[PDB]
Symmetry: C3
Subunit: 59 residues, 3 copies
C-alpha cells in the first residue's frame, strides 16, 4: 500500500529532477556553482531513496 | 500517519509541478520535445499517485 | 521503514525547492505573481510535512 505510493512519489520526483536539469539547461558564475551542488545532492538523495525502497519492499 | 505525510508530499510535488511548468513557460527545438514528454509522464504519475492515495486511505 | 523513505522523499523535495527558486532566480508581471504564491504555498507545505514527520517518528 504505502510502499506502492512510496515508489510513485519517488518516480514523480525522479522525473521532475530530469525536468529541472532541463530548465537549468535552458536557463544557462555563482549561480552555476549553487545549481551544481544541488544537482549532486539530489542525485545522491534519489539513490539513497531508491535503495531504501528496495529494502521496505523486501518485507 | 504515514498516509497523512503521504498526501503532503504528493501536494508539494503537485505544486512544484505547476511551478516548473512556469519556469519552463518563462524559459521558453529538441528542448521543447524533451520538456514536453516529461510534462505528460509526470501528470500521469501524479494521477496514479493520487488514485493510490484514495486506496490506501480507504483502510 | 516507510518513515525512513518518508524523510528521504521530503529532503529530495526540500532540495528541489531550493533549485527551483534558483531557476526562477535565473529566469527572472503576472508571471512573478503566480510564481510567488507557489513559492509560499510550497514552503508552508514543506513545514507541515516536516512537523508531520516528527509526529510519525515518535511512534
Amino acid at each position: 500500500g504505502i510502499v506502492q505510493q512510496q515508489q510513485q512519489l519517488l518516480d514523480v520526483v525522479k522525473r521532475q529532477q530530469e525536468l529541472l536539469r532541463l530548465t537549468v539547461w535552458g536557463t544557462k558564475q555563482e549561480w552555476e556553482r549553487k545549481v551544481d551542488f544541488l544537482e549532486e545532492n539530489i542525485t545522491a538523495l534519489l539513490e539513497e531513496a531508491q535503495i531504501q525502497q528496495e529494502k521496505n519492499m523486501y518485507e
